[model samples]
Target: MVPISPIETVPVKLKPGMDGPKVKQWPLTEEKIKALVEICTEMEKEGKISKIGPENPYNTPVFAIKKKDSTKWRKLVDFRELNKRTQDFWEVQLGIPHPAGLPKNKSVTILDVGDAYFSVPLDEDFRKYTAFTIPSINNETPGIRYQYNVLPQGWKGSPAIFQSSMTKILEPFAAQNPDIVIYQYMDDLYVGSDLEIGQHRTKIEELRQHLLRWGLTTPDKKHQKEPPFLWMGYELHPDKWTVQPIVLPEKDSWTVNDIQKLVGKLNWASQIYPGIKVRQLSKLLRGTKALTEVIPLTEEAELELAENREILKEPVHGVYYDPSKDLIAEIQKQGQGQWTYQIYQEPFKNLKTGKYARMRGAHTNDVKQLTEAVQKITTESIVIWGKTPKFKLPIQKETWETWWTEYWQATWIPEWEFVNTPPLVKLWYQLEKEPIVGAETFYVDGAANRETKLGKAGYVTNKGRQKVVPLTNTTNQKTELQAIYLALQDSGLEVNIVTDSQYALGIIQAQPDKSESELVNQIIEQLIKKEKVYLAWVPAHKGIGGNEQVDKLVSA
Candidate 1:
């Protein structure tokens, strides 16, 4: 609603040698062209854009698109070439607020800023490069070239500059207004408070005034207030967030896109709803080659959907993760080497009164169980109060106990190698890089046939990527180190390197001068990149004998 302050501007830089040929204007009706000219004249009056001189070589088409649900035309610049020259940068903060993470508030006021991009001006030095052409209202006159002095919507770096600017400007405001915390996600800012919207209206007016001074204004029509307000496509309640009721299609089959659309929304909602079996949707996409492929909605899929509907019917509070709260994990080995577990805290009134309501999921196998379970944990003091295994509880009784008294980080390592004493699961909480820790386990092993004087080294990611290489005149120990080094060099994040060779872990940790110092150093070099990578010692005799499988590969 307000024009940008003349002094404020951003440099919309283009890469070196970005000069390109002009793009021709698309054909437009006389009526539409007249409307477009009016809009340009209005923008010119506001100093949003200025006439470009004939010497300006860069020009893209300028067009008018009809506004949705309105007869008005929205001005748009076809800066496709300008964008290509800009070489878009992706450093952006999504800043999407999860209802689960937010503390309870009595009221919420959602604000929408008018002229989001244009509220920030583009630097005069870079304006000429943003020139666009449009046919003059008078047919006798040639096309008019104009340069945007303000940020354009489709420009590649608009979000980066605008968001950064807004975030910088609002930092002080955030510090001052702790009780009525305003969350800004790009142009949309929402403030929630203990008081109702009426009581908080004046406080937000000050916020609006702050926005107005910066060339932005929030329109009253676009404002949402009080409890149960909607923000970012999710409904917010006092206690929980929810998506609108879902209605599965009656058709017997669905395209991959259809399933994806359903799953995408559900996956987002799932994080807000504890115990949600959102992964069940992954089962629907299994074996599908592409998003366009049509797949049957099996009976199992239908049943799961119905259950999800029932779960969403009554909004619950279990999804909330308080880092201050005490957490306990109940993990057990289910059928087929699969481990299923629920993470919880002290008793809560709803869901189950005995323990805080929590989420549960199954790891497909022992291969990635701990690493997978790590995702369910929030950073803080936690206790694992139950068995981790038949090589868990029942068949082979055990107490696999571990506790953290203070803030701890455990990027989950899946391969839990059990021993007669302390057992084999180790979590280096100090090394975790995220709020929740999980490192996908990479199981590596090597074998040598002394009689044949041959050896092989191989590593398999729990994700199923595996490689086995033959080696001549190499010892098993050497092959084992080789396997560790290979996996370290060729891999990605969320990682835990599992090896049967304690020798490999020992050398990796000590980095001492040894017979295998060359291979160890190379592996050490790679470890520098992932400075926190953990090596879990699992015995070769364990179930599934990860090392035994590699032995078969080497011997063959």
Candidate 2:
């Protein structure tokens, strides 16, 4: 009989004799992870399964390959050099129009180029022609002065340059055919049509031909037909940012980097596509970070490290408990001090017979129960809160204000949110982080690291190319806020909106609602007069027909 490898498990030890209660230990080993991976691979080979995560929910397996380009390295570049060398860098932002959607004329342009310097040759003669000519930093070149600067590949600037160039190429077409609206970022283009006939295939074909003539080529895609197309996230009935056939997945499995690029660069088409979630996508990013941390991590473990910190935090709150012998007493006194528990991962054979492990985190006395743990979690609730309520009384916040103002404000809000929120809501919040929501799509195969990075965007769409929408990140929240701002942008008067975000809903719904509504009010006031923004959450991962279609558009 062929030997089937068993899943690996590890066991963690509890502090002996804790005063409050019994400390339970669970297994934590790499074996389960390895075993699950093997099983999934076998199933995939046998054509019994196709996907690994929840998108399809039935057959897929997760693959762990070598991580490459996983680093979000933001390389500082000398744009001036590239700007001087290339056709004067033009800046543009592209938004694909939804099917049957009309064009909005407003646009932002910036010099969009990366390694802008590299595009220009460093020849000694060319050096004399441009101001940016400088000697290569690596000392590889001759006396000719040149700076070979590359923009951070994943930075904000790269797409900006790409957009600008797209605008430059399409400007003449827009001028001649004033009705042919064009939006662009880098190579991605969104052409909108207010006409009933939809995209003029001839004009779109010409546009494509011209773009190619100018040294910029549209990416080839399998799902797409021709010029009057949807290449990015936007629908191109009048041919805007239609789904790119080139980027769509033809098969069941994809490498890691393919997933990341699919998710990360989604904005080339704007948020017109569906099902991508920024937060879930970010998890892929965080996971990459966690996975990459080695050397030092390999030498020592960090599980107990989280527990130790929890122990310290409780003391700061004036809560104290013995770690030894009296666990029940410690738990009883948990609220008095702080509580911290360490969780371990357990391996289980999934439906595919692939062995994989899921995790449960440390629990404090008060928050130890399964319901409590589940409630505290938003996505991926794997912790076993246990069967019992485990406490005599619930200690939830007494008032909305207490929770909203006290804990939430102090911790959750980033410092930049104050400044970045109002001024650039249009650019920062207009679209989704992951447009594909719940649908899973085949990702392009390239570097595994880049693939994982993009995986976060597609997380909400995990049902294997099916459609589901979940706000997976702060960006979605920001988009929601932006929508509210946009909705109020043209109204020019006071307006009221009901929200479900605990902080937002509480303030709006408050009886004789406090003046805090003023913040939203002022924003709304601007929105009423300025833009067309509204805010709301899509139900999580329902995969309804419409949402799924939208998810496909975004993911494609």
Candidate 3:
């Protein structure tokens, strides 16, 4: 094994008096032990693993997992305790461009690195923290322990260190060869572009040579193909300029782990297909703790997943542009109390007609940045796409309210239509005059004291009728239900039941149990049979003619 060293390393910090937690050991069979020993021996020979002193501050347990499609078992160390103390020193921006945006005629090549984490050396001080004690391979060596000399698999900092090193190694090359675009996800590198095939070939060779010089091994087989399709998890069809997920695992028997994995895939797709529907479903699963927990799928969730599955299958056409999607405007703090506003486009379209749009914008964290971004966008409707841009004010209300009021009043103007009579009133023309010919708006109200209760139903119709009743004994909820119940029975024609009490309306909509209340049960049964019956809410004592009259009548 080559004793590889990354360009840099990250230091580990822990709380005082806490080095690492003690982990319970697992029962291992002789076969499992042999498999673990074989892997450790090979890695040790390669200089990646080395013996650790008994005084090493950290000790984690070790185990073996079988390799996919192979009999070989790989050794793994539990780094959970150490990971809690590890701080990230590097951040990789993961804004991957959709394959549709890739050069139509560019050469595409995929590259993979072997034993990616082992290519990076561990920090001298931090190396001992990765120590794990395994059973002695032979009886002769009873109590041996080892630690990683190089960055080991499952170490918290391994990915960061490897990525940092790769970035340093590739940054210069990127500047020198602008035509050879490269996208990397860990050890796998995607290289090539619409540039000449010869340039792509040369760049692939150049990259291989660099990896060799850096003591990293590259896969021997690689080819340049037309409109190369798959990358990361996205499958691309360049002919149609579309991409979709390659896998849609069955959700009927899915565990929380499966749901989370599906959610992750959809979340990535949300970035590609902005303003898509899967975003909400993904959000529902994001709050769960253990990925392995079982999650039940509701009918609504199942339907949404199915709909998204079909939608993803359909290819999104050229340069997706829809102003109807929500326009996001947010202000967030940067380092050292500096403020900046963030705004991005949905379905990321270009300003140029027929070309795809840019998804994001850069600006200083200020209100002006938000204004400038919003000013450039032109939409069919005055209403901003999606939800209203939420503004976080740095100071008191006077500052924000003034700007907020002024901006909306001046810039985002509204268009309104004033109606002389309500639109639905015209539908009453179709009904016969006898046995309730016209539609009626029944505004119901109730008044109650501990010992006495009263209710009234007020009607607004061409043929007007109203009623007041004294309840010998009842609650307001039951009173309200009885009012609507009587109104439904009295009117054979279309009727609108308007009431301020949400309890009655909520019970109707909630599909309340038949046995809960005979009156509520009657309301539900009557509602189902009457096709034209509707329920609406109006504020109580709002001085509306129907509501006021009913309140006075019930009080009287």
Candidate 4:
């Protein structure tokens, strides 16, 4: 039997200026109003929700929503206001097994813990914080306030708390049944093994009994018994190598709502099926403009959709090879001529030469062809992490204290600071006269090895102004940006900074958060206020004194 438990008291700490305020609810149709009332009443009867007294200080708004392709209305609590007031201390780690790690012969069983969050009881003191007001039983009466008795769905802390509870419940079972791999993502639990069918069923049955003991409800028909199962909208097959898209069937008649639904499906599908050229179709529905407006597909969109149909019709396959095996294939680069492609079994190792066999000039289509080859190696289980068949690396876990310590020290400016205004733009008009004859020269450099990254920035003009910091989880471009930012901070006067990073300069010029462009944003914050700041790039490793000094500083 599994032990059932709720989260202990964890209070939310709001930012200095924030107060949990009651937001005015959105207007709803008469049908939606009735639906909300019915749903709330049903929830109360099931011991899933409760009413709050007028004494509660915090109350968020509540509204109703109609589920997609259905008449069912779900009552939703708007937690945005409450979320703004809440500080995130919890770090959630959702564990799911690599598809390539699964046994090829075994069928995966997926079980959903129905309304899993609501199954966890709510702490008494924290109850009022989850309060919301809805229309009373009588349509003409004043709104009645209610709070959740169980963990509410939209609460900021719900997922972290719920995940913690579930992890605690499943830990023992996982330890006991080593062969039966239990992978959990939120409420969905996937159980699979290389063991016989009967052995797998026995473990699943035991799991179900434990869930019952814990008062966790799973629907009667929630267990899937076949290959190519759909879990969280991803189509996973028994082959363990293939993750195919859930392509929706084409429709003849279309509405704004229908096209909107199709567009939403296509957008999600594009993420899984990356090789498909559906950017045009995806761009057509950007911000979902079609949802509110009656827009027909343009001629180009129709042709692109047809092209996408062909690409999505068949399963996009790739090979999962072992480097221990002789798996070198040849591919011709469009203009650069032909090159040998090799798949290595080890990650971050040279892919060509030695006993490991290193080959170069790997083409994208060649990897796609290799994906198709993985189907033939169905006799045993394998793990492939890369598109070109590289070995998977183990993920290391850091303590909560470690994550929070870094989070506190990191340069994470909230997007809200620049929300109201666009980034500053400038057109230079050369001045005839120099503002100041004196200027500071700062040298910035970044260094990265396989395991660690380091950045250093300092002034050559000023003494005791050099500073070096060890950076974590950074790319070369990001590391360079960090150095550039530090250099800007060292001086407020006229400055000329030197670097050897074009990637960092390109990011600063773009001024968009496309890829880990946070450092560029930080640089822009200083650039907007400073006058006569110029950045110049010097050729790297050319015995330049300042560049070499910072390079050595970063390496040290």
Top candidate when judged by lDDT against the true structure: 1
lDDT of 2 at 1: 45
For each candidate, how many residue pairs have backbone atoms clashing (under 3 Å)? 6, 120, 11, 9
Local accuracy of candidate 3 as per-residue lDDT tens digits, 424-514: 1111111122333256767777666645544443343334677777775677677777778777777765787677877775655433323
Winner of 1 and 3 under TM-score: 1
Worst 10 residues of 2 by lDDT: 349-358
Error of 4 at 177 (Å): 1.2
Q: Which stretches of candidate 2 lie over 4 Å from their true place?
A: 1-162, 192-199, 219-556
lDDT by residue (tens digit), candidate 1, 377-434? 3221122222221111121112223322221333333223343332233322223333
Best by TM-score: 1
Query: How many pairs in model 2 have backbone atoms within 3 A of each other, for residues 3 or more apart or on separate chains, i.e. clashes?
Result: 120
* Predictions in order: lDDT: 0.60, 0.30, 0.57, 0.56
- The lDDT of model 4 is 0.56
* lDDT score of residue 496 within candidate 1: 72
What local lDDT does model 4 show for residue 338?
14
| Candidate 4 per-residue lDDT over residues 1-556, each given as its tens digit | 5576544444545667766666775556667777877888899898888876778767777888777888677788888887777767466764554443333446457788755656777666667667777765445776777788876887777887777777787888888888777766666776777688888788888888777766776653454546556555545655433344556667654446765666666654543343333334444555654455555677766776786687578755333334355323221111111111223334322222111111232221222222222322211122233233322111112222232243223321111111111112122211112334466778888866546644333334334467778876665666677888888787775676778888766554433322234555566666655777767778888999888888887765
- RMSD, each candidate, Å? 14.3, 34.2, 13.3, 18.9
Cand. 2 TM to true fold: 0.21
What is the full ranking by lDDT, best candidate first?
A: 1, 3, 4, 2
TM-score of each: 0.60, 0.21, 0.54, 0.48
